[PDB]
Write a protein that binds this ligand. Sequence first.
Ligand code: K
Ligand code: K
Ligand code: MG
Ligand code: MG
Ligand code: MG
Ligand code: MG
Ligand code: MG
Ligand code: MG
Ligand code: MG
Ligand code: MG
Ligand code: MG
Ligand code: MG
Ligand code: MG
Ligand code: MG
Ligand code: MG
Ligand code: MG
Ligand code: MG
Ligand code: MG
Ligand code: MG
Ligand code: MG
Ligand code: MG
Ligand code: MG
Ligand code: MG
Ligand code: MG
Ligand code: MG
Ligand code: MG
Ligand code: MG
Ligand code: MG
Ligand code: MG
Ligand code: MG
Ligand code: MG
Ligand code: MG
Ligand code: MG
Ligand code: MG
Ligand code: MG
Ligand code: MG
Ligand code: MG
Ligand code: NA
Ligand code: NA
Ligand code: NA
Ligand code: NA
Ligand code: NA
Ligand code: NA
Ligand code: NA
Ligand code: NA
Ligand code: NA
Ligand code: NA
Lengths: 399, 220
Amino acid sequence: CKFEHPRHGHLGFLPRKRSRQIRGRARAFPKDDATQKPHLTSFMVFKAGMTHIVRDVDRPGSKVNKKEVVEPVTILEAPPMVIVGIVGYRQTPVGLKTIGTVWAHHTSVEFRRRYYKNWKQSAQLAFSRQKQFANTKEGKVAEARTLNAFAKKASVIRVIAHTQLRKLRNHRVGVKKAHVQEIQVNGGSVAAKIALAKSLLEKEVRVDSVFQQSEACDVCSVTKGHGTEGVVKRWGVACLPRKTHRGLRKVACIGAWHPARVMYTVARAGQHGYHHRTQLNKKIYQIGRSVAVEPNQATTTYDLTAKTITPMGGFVGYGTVRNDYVMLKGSVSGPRRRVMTLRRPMAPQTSRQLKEKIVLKFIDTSSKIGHGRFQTKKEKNQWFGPLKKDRIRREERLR
Amino acid sequence: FPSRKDAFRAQRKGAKKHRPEIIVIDLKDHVLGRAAAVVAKQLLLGKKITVVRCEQLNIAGTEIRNKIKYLQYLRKRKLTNPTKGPFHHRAPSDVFVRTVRSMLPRYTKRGMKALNSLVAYEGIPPNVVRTGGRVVIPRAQRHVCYRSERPYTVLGNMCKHVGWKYSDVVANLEKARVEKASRHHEKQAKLRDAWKSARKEALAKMPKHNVEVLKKFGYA
RNA sequence: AUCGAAUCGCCACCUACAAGACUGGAGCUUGCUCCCUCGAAGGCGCCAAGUAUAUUCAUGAUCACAAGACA
RNA sequence: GUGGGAUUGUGAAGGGAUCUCGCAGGUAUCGUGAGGGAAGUAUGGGGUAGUACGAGAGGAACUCCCAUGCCGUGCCUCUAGUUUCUGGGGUUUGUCGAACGGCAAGUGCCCCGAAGCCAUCGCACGGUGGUUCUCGGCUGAACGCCUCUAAGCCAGAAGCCAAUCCCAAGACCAGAUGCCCACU
RNA sequence: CGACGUCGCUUUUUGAUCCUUCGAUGUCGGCUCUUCCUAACCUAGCGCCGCAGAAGACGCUAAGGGUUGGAUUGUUCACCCACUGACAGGGAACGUGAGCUGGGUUUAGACCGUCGUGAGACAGGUUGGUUUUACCCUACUUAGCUGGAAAUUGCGAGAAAAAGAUUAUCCGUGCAAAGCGGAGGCGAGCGGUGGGUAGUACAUGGUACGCUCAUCACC
RNA sequence: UUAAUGAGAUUCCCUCUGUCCCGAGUUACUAUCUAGCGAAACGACAGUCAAGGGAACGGACUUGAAGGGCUAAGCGGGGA
RNA sequence: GAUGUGGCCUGGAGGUUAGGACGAAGCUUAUGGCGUGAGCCUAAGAUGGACCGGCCUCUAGUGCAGAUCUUGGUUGGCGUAGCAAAGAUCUAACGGAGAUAUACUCAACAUGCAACGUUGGAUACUGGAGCGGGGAAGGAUUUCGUGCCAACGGCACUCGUA
RNA sequence: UUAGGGAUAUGUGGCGUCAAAACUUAUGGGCUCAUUCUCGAUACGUGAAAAGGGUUGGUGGAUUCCACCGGCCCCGAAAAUGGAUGACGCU
RNA sequence: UCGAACCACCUAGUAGCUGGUUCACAUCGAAGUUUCCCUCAGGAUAGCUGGUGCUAGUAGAAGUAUUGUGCGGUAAAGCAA
RNA sequence: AAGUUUGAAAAGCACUUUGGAAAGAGAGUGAAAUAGAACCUGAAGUCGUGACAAAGACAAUGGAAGUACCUCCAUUUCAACGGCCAGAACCAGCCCUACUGCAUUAUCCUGUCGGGGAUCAAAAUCCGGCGGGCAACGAAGUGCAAGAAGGGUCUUGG
Ligand SMILES: [K+]
Ligand SMILES: [K+]
Ligand SMILES: [Mg+2]
Ligand SMILES: [Mg+2]
Ligand SMILES: [Mg+2]
Ligand SMILES: [Mg+2]
Ligand SMILES: [Mg+2]
Ligand SMILES: [Mg+2]
Ligand SMILES: [Mg+2]
Ligand SMILES: [Mg+2]
Ligand SMILES: [Mg+2]
Ligand SMILES: [Mg+2]
Ligand SMILES: [Mg+2]
Ligand SMILES: [Mg+2]
Ligand SMILES: [Mg+2]
Ligand SMILES: [Mg+2]
Ligand SMILES: [Mg+2]
Ligand SMILES: [Mg+2]
Ligand SMILES: [Mg+2]
Ligand SMILES: [Mg+2]
Ligand SMILES: [Mg+2]
Ligand SMILES: [Mg+2]
Ligand SMILES: [Mg+2]
Ligand SMILES: [Mg+2]
Ligand SMILES: [Mg+2]
Ligand SMILES: [Mg+2]
Ligand SMILES: [Mg+2]
Ligand SMILES: [Mg+2]
Ligand SMILES: [Mg+2]
Ligand SMILES: [Mg+2]
Ligand SMILES: [Mg+2]
Ligand SMILES: [Mg+2]
Ligand SMILES: [Mg+2]
Ligand SMILES: [Mg+2]
Ligand SMILES: [Mg+2]
Ligand SMILES: [Mg+2]
Ligand SMILES: [Mg+2]
Ligand code: NA
Ligand code: NA
Ligand code: NA
Ligand code: NA
Ligand code: NA
Ligand code: NA
Ligand code: NA
Ligand code: NA
Ligand code: NA
Ligand code: NA
């Protein structure tokens, strides 16, 4: 008979436990349409940092129609992935079972370190017997039989892809063992999927071959961790009055007399953050090329200044974006340096917002350390001019 | 999946490939409760039973009556912690296993042994297809148990409407199984016919007094 | 390699399928008549590889888990 | 059988005998997904339109598309808050003879302050199929006729179920794999 | 909608009883938080009206979602201001005091009125008046290690596996077809790892590729 | 009735503010982990639930439903 | 609730019969046998060290599971709660058993840690209403030197009002 | 209604499984369909009325229908943790 | 330590009230009702029970019938008594 | 509160060894150091350790019947012998068998006349007469049975 308000938190994200993995993993793939061409559905990226952009909006009826807006964006570095294997799945009354794996003839050191805790001091025998066997005629026959089994019984075909940390030449991402994920091949018949996958073997796949610029994607990633947290932060319950004996930041009543136990719907202290999330409908604002190929990464048709996607001073705690990258509108779960998965969208992409063609007019590259007011180092140089240390440097130059 | 010790010991012993005495029951068009009772009593008697085609069990009444029964059962759940609550299984073979379990002393070791002697399948999986002639339970068959004017439900349809998601998989697999089995049966028709004609001519080749003996006991 | 076990029907003919208000087939008169493969057996297996001119069995002594079991 | 241990309490040293235990798995990935959880929900504006209805006064709704509450899950580019980076300055009393360097006032005090954390105080994102209710029909008897039902069918609610989402093999996965070992 | 009659239902009121508790089950309200019910206020569909439209009345399915901010009052109730789609009603030991708070109630101090000769009384008013303990079990929340299908044992053998001299005695394909195509040693084949050399490819330090010498294995 | 006085009771106004909208960030000391030291309360036996009956609110009883073992930090639903 | 019992049991007495250093009482038990039972009796002590059993009768402070029972001991909780006001110590040398403490390999790290008293130096605090210097009350050797660290100084000690 | 043991046979209650017994007896007759409250299987007792309407019975009239009376089923029939013919289930 | 301090004693104060009350099995086995009581949480008193027996062991028996003979105003009936 | 109650004598553990010491390991005394000093006996409870038994989660304990493994226990038997296990025979007593006679039927059984019925015509179902009667299969499920003597006894004792 009391005053009413909704409960705190979403019981569908239970338990608030630490995620089993640090990598974002797709728990489902888009519905497979056999009418389309065979195509990959996912890609692993690394979060570098955030900035903001200006664009004009194409949305008739809106008060911002034909008007500039500024959008925060997230930059995710996407070095190409390497396809090392093919797996097939057959459907049974108890769910999908993998038929087998067709391994590539050659694997990178980075892929093989994933099988070790201490690679440098190990014997480094991973895949050696497999190489010596598959190379022969009995091995060729076994591979042919596995491929024929894929053709005969598989309804689902996925590729085994791994990341290239040597190409992701990042100093703070300490890991050197490649990240491995199964990427599902959608489109076409099963034979067509197998042909695409077999062509992909031992090859590099670039993020622009999986995703196009103005499309949207879903992001699988794990959120930033906070360790043990109380109910106020973890659940959003109210703080108690100042007058409260023995503590304020808690739930006053954790239950009625009956049931004579505590329900699972009551907010408790515990792990907060480090949870897996799937975060659909992130618009791709840009798929950039690596700076060693195209250094004018942040240049647009309206801002002719030559600049890269890296802000002055670098991304804080991350460094330089050296590879291909993806500009996503808004935010994604997880901190910088964390590997994440971009998945082709599962929700229907027919709204005006999701179909809108994105054209960037300005990309902010000012310092992310302390109220950056210069877009480029040349702008700062022309503000300040000759400083004392530059004069000393020239004085040394003349002698 | 046997341990390496089990395989090594079997290799040492020189014993052959063994299979326990197992009865395979085709539950298509069987009354759910009556088949469950018969199977439970036989399990307490030590029998090893595999039941196939649990998706084609029957319950008396319209499908909606029995789906509503299932939904009533589904809402039973431990409110303070639904994990550890009643676990509601949607698959038809799971439903049959639960029905049999409720007809056993499941909280004794003897009842547990009996329940672990039962294997339930939807359709007829390939590991069962060739193990021998399957059996029926005459006192639990629909065509003698239900007056045919009454509506009845097929267990798989109810299950798929209450959450079972493998109906189409089992349907396609059963179609493939029947097609393969019918091809294998149309072939070997010549072998069966050869054996029939062989017995017919053996009659004209055996000694006559034996033929008369067969005649008086109804075999010739 | 412990290890002695309890278990005692095999099969490459059952090991495909559907229906029981219609079961092999017809007919018209529609519940009877006519035809047949005549509608109540999965095949073997049970001591001569086959139905007969045979051929080792003990004393393991009158019951005992069959003292033996790749049919 | 192989090996390693050990028997019951009254010395020592050798012999048996008998128990007990080990005799095949380790370790590293990618997955499956039964079961459980479960979430999105409202308002307004544009237009429909001042039209349908109406003597007149008055006066609607949906395709659509533009926002906004609430709730949920995140994020830190911006703006705001926070500073023991006691960062850089400034300033009081005391104090090392002075300047210097500072130091004490449990962070002296004041201004500005990165990084991090963080606010509906900021920013982003929140999806699809069945199956039924009530009810309305179709075909159609019982019962000439009729009838929405009786046997069949159709359409159908913010309901229920599943998908998507979260945990996940005591759900004991004979799912697939890398490498040693054992078996061979 | 419904007189006067009549039949229920419910335990959200109060009474009646005195069954449990008097070697003690913390007692009103609020706050906080979760859950449940429906006799439905709003939100979704649908009937019907005296239903022209707009606004509404009554009913049906429906409890998935939602159901405010304030003045006076200890209050629950109330009723006033205002917002709103709406500001529905209940249960959970009159949910919830080792969760709080302590305004009320209910000790000792004190004042008043009335009563009493008096000490004192009041179901009347007033003011002031200690809110104790969790490190045990379970529950719940997170967080580690670890056996285990005869749920630790039996050696007690069941694959959502293949398909054959009884899974042995080859590999592919094909329908569990018809057939069809490959399959003492030296040398050869096929490859794994090292030398020489030569483009090229891929995101461009690091792998693959053609030729030759070496070794290694398997055949 | 009363100026003055009051850690007396009450109402309103200005100022002011984390009292609140609605919470956020920082510090010291704890908790926490380690070395040394080391108690008490309490303790029938013990501890997963639903319903049912029952001294009319069960941890034990009836019928169902759960339940692999051992642990660290918390927490105040129950242990009437 | 009443009553019976050549019913059981315990400490003493009058009798009568035995036993014990070749081991009494007591105590221990997968230690058997007997009895419906209270209990009795044997065995074995790799237990003990000096008294004591049976039977008839007499006699009494004569039988325990519980009284918020009495006294002593133990015990889970538990290596737990905690030992958080009064700001604080650092460094070298000396002293000390208190160390630089080791199987093979091994140069040293990764295999002796943590803690002491004194002197010197550094840093800080008390801040004269003082962890200053003297008295009453109260205490009565706590004063001083040397020695010593079993117990005590809720951690420690080579130090101490021990 | 009771010394402690066996055999045999009963009582009340049962005979689909739990759970001994019709391994689901008969070569017995009828009746009954029920959709979120679950129809029924509830002696004591532990889930109901006034009132009304699918099927198959009866009585009394009229030309198949009229009225009336039973059986079983249905409606009337709304509460708070998820739950109870004891459970599964049975037609 | 205070709506009558503390110490020792009278004092093991009294309690119709609360709590406790130590071996076996054998034969039997209740009452919560009556009357009186400042009696109602207690007693006396009779009943129910046990133990003793005594007396000529079938007697002066009976929670039952039958037959004979008395008693009755409740159920029903009545309001035309 | 508190028995000094070691042992017959103190014979109260020289000496070696390592440790700072306390002590430890040896060696001695003593009949005995589980007689080593507030030391006879040395219980219960609690704890350590070794060997073993196993064991999910049914809190544990408990009852009753078995079984597996153990058993420092008891008792019995060990040859013209057993008091142990088991199987068949007989006997006595019980307990299940297999075998059924007497009475009764009439609202009944049969034939034929008459009717009445129904379909193409019949027969039948049915009703009254008449003449006969046993529906006699294992007649009938109606009343009462009085029929002596195969199989069970680890349900008894020989
Ligand atoms: K410690
Ligand atoms: K019996
Ligand atoms: Mg972090
Ligand atoms: Mg307080
Ligand atoms: Mg649910
Ligand atoms: Mg044998
Ligand atoms: Mg900041
Ligand atoms: Mg300072
Ligand atoms: Mg109490
Ligand atoms: Mg209490
Ligand atoms: Mg309480
Ligand atoms: Mg309190
Ligand atoms: Mg409080
Ligand atoms: Mg006060
Ligand atoms: Mg005052
Ligand atoms: Mg005052
Ligand atoms: Mg606050
Ligand atoms: Mg703590
Ligand atoms: Mg309960
Ligand atoms: Mg209890
Ligand atoms: Mg508690
Ligand atoms: Mg008594
Ligand atoms: Mg005495
Ligand atoms: Mg006494
Ligand atoms: Mg007692
Ligand atoms: Mg502690
Ligand atoms: Mg100072
Ligand atoms: Mg002083
Ligand atoms: Mg100390
Ligand atoms: Mg049975
Ligand atoms: Mg039946
Ligand atoms: Mg029952
Ligand atoms: Mg005082
Ligand atoms: Mg006394
Ligand atoms: Mg008492
Ligand atoms: Mg008696
Ligand atoms: Mg009367
Ligand atoms: Na699920
Ligand atoms: Na700022
Ligand atoms: Na600031
Ligand atoms: Na007066
Ligand atoms: Na805990
Ligand atoms: Na005692
Ligand atoms: Na501390
Ligand atoms: Na009784
Ligand atoms: Na019947
Ligand atoms: Na001696």
